Amino acid sequence: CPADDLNAMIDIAKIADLVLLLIDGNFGFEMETMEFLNIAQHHGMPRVLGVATHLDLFKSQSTLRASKKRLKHRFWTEVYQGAKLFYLSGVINGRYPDREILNLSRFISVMKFRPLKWRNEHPYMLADRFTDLTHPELIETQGLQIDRKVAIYGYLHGTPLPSAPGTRVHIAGVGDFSVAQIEKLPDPCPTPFYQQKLDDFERDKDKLIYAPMSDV
Amino acid sequence: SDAVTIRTRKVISNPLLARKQFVVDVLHPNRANVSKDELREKLAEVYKAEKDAVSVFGFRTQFGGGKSVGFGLVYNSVAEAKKFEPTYRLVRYGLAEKVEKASRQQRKQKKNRDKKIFGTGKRLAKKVARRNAD
Amino acid sequence: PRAPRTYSKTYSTPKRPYESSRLDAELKLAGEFGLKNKKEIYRISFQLSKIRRAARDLLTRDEKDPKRLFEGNALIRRLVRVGVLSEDKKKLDYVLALKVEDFLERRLQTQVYKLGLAKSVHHARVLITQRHIAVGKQIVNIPSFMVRLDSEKHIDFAPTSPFGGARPGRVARRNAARKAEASGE
Amino acid sequence: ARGPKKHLKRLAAPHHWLLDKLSGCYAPRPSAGPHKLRESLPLIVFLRNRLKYALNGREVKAILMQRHVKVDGKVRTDTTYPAGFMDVITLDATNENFRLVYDVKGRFAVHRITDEEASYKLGKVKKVQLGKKGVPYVVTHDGRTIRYPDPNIKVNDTVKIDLASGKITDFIKFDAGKLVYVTGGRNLGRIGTIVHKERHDGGFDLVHIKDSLDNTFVTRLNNVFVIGEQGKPYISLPKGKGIKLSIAEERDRRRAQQGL
RNA sequence: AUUCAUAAUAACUUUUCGAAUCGCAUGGCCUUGUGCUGGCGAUGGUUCAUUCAAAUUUCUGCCCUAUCAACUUUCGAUGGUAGGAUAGUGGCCUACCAUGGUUUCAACGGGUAACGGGGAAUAAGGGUUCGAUUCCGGAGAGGGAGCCUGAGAAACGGCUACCACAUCCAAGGAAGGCAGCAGGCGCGCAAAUUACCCAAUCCUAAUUCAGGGAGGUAGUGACAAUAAAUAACGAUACAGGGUCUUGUAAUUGGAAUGAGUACAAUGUAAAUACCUUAACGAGGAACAAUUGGAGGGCAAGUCUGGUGCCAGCAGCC
RNA sequence: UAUCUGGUUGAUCCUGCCAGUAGUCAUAUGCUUGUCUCAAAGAUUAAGCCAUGCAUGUCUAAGUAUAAGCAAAUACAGU
């Protein structure tokens, strides 16, 4: 999440299915956390999982335990009571200790989600990469300012968005358009079970990461 | 911190472990506490004790301060003071070095890994080396 | 997988809580003796009811019964040592006629107020609570101490507790520092 | 339940050990030996709870493995060795001896004895049979089997086994008028004289015992340990001599000894 | 109380036992030979006794149901005989022979959200209800069934097969059992740490030494329970009771102290925390207490304003 | 010592029910939750299903040491 902006923050709270909400332990709760929690509560609450960082800055165990209890009870006020949150110790090698990260991975590898009302009728889409498709001669000849044809890639969630061209589309923070064309590219990061199913139709050792938005 | 009074009551002589056992109580009307190394030094100079053969280990300060009651004991001929004392109290007095091991999870995991081989395992090592090398 | 430790309730909420007679009676009790709330009165009433049940069970027993003699002598000696029963009232007919005001009088709050140096039961309560009382030579800060009869004459200020000398407290040091750094120069 | 039990929890230990119910959830559980485990005493309880010569269990083990503690003249290195009645537990580091006898309150008492009289021990002979090759033998209350006894030594009597190799010394017959210790029931620790033996065929004979204050009681036959003639016990009795005063005069004696 | 203990005669046996073991000591004798003899132990071994146990076992005592009155007895049900098997008694099983055994004092069948007891609560007493659960006994290790080893298991952190689930892969095969400690799923509506240690209590072994999620320590939703802070003493002006006793105040004066922070020391296996303490830490004590209710019943409002309607008076107050 | 008051009546009395106040080793839930001591915690519905880690191993002077193991009595002798 871009922390300073509220706009994409609201879009994230509208879209996300699991939200890892992180709080500085030594500082306390901040206004961004409260604003995101209220936006998520009003727009349809997703699965919220709290994590607290900067806990090695505490110099005494008594203050650390009391602050952990206070943060946990404030979280239990904002979220359902008994909700468990994770305590992260240090950043000693640019990353967190292995046990806490293991428990974070284990909790979200067995959890199930709730059917929200808004997600189950309106189709939505998370865009993973971006490409502008215009001819460079069209860019050069008529002054670089004519509005463009843009093809964007991503994953569909919620509802089937019909295969007829011209269905109306809203892009949050941009506006309202009508889509010219759509197609289904093959999935670039398939599950392994999909790969044994494919191999069974004819009868990915390291590419578990698909990040076209960033560089390798 | 004006003065400290050191009184050893209930003294029982134990020739079974070759020591003397007692309940110390200290009147320390001002300072903070007992300062157990300093208290050990003065209890050593009390009898004739050769300080490393003196062990005071139980202590509790009475509510309101000033009075602190604990249990301690003094050996003789410090060789069996090293023989008969527990290891943690020997380390606490500087008479031993704290040994470094792995945690219990790592030790138990190492034991369970070594449980899965029969013999020294050099045969299996050479077999898997020649199998996965070629 | 261990031995259970014993515990008991020390009070009992009345079945008829807000009837006016017991309400203003316990209001008078908590006002004259400076009690914090109504659990003090209920606790003292629970102790009085236990003593009354013991005295009734002993008085139903026959005279010169060794059980009656032993437990009656023990109970009367205990209440004399506490300070409730008078020295000329060592009979079971008189412990069946006891009252909660005898137990409320015996507590440390009143017993430091009645000896002077406190000037009100609430100043006595605050003085005890703020870690000042020295019973014998031991610092007491519990207002329901129930002072023993033999220990009634040893109540004084601590070797700590700056009203008994020994380096006056923090706000006096604050005032001295302010008068030294600002009023001094 | 599928085999023998090796643990004994606190609240299941015998009450006469005086083990506090806090500070641990397990009891010593004395091993197999000469005495029944509910009428015996482990060496750890004697060296720690009674004598207070040790502070932990490993200190008791360090005492025992140093070959200091001897039961009936023999070195024992067992932490939970079941010492019981009439044992001659002795310590040579302190040059100090004990005889395990019951206090009048119903528990084993600390009864220091001299160097002499720590060289013999009374044992209630409990069965007299005939062994292999026609050799008569007796066995007593602590499993001591003695070959070739006196022909007048009958069942349910006492014998004087010294320390070394059995070799029964002078014995006394079970009869009316003898001095008797009570080693069971609610009359535990009381000493008296037999006045009648109410014999019952089928089982469970009864003994009527009158103490030195002429306050009689009755007990079963198997809780009777004859320990000498009237006015002369064959050992040194503990403090109080087994009188069982009621709580009133015990309290009065406590205030009599109270002060200065 | 015995055909008991034990002894004796005759024989018998795929026939047992009666030390071919280990450590630490270097003594004594002379025929002066690595001669003779000899100490303290460790471990095995036959039987008896003992101890830790186990298996059967006598008497009496369990909730509801008659819209359950007859039940067992083919294919053992009651008993006698002989045998097999058992560690041993025994219809435990087998061959034979009798026809028995239980019951209106309730046999038998059925239900039980029925493990039993010590115990818990409500009572003045009798009763009534609860007891999965810190101790004792029993049973089980997803459901039947069988077995090896061993003194002891019909053992499941042992084995074999069947039933139901279910893991791996190269498709040939291998492997499984959290009603142990953590932890997860079982609804999309939720509840302790996949932490530290054998220091204490004890248990195991060849064994002072190793091991122990048994157990202890700390963490975690106010289970339940104990004690207890959030203020105390004044001066001034009004209101009083009226010259000595109180309330009110965007009035004021100094004392006292811990909730927290923290050198130190104690504590502890190492810690956290408690107890102790140099220093910091209070006027809006902002270092900021809550949950309900108000004619009654078993307490505290004959308090205030606003709203919907009226074919009631006036007509927009 | 042992907590009841009304309605069901115009009164007098059974019988059940309702409204109210109070006590709860009773279940569930809400709000609030500074200190000390203490100690309960997947039975209630499912003896339903389980990822991963651990939970049973053990050596004395005294059973077997030629480790081409480690340091320093030509039969071995420490660990």
Side-chain angles (χ1 to χ4, degrees), chain D residues 121-137:
Chain D
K121 155 180 181 142
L122 291 153
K124 172 154 98 162
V125 53
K126 290 180 71 67
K127 76 191 290 184
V128 185
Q129 283 313 339
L130 189 65
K132 303 291 181 183
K133 301 183 182 292
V135 171
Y137 70 98

Side-chain angles (χ1 to χ4, degrees), chain C residues 133-140 145 151-159:
Chain C
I133 285 300
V135 177
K137 284 305 210 156
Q138 204 273 335
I139 280 185
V140 185
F145 176 60
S151 176
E152 198 162 299
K153 68 171 293 300
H154 284 149
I155 301 145
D156 203 18
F157 289 85

Side-chain angles (χ1 to χ4, degrees), chain C residues 158-170:
Chain C
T160 301
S161 83
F163 303 170
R167 201 181 165 272
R170 45 189 284 248

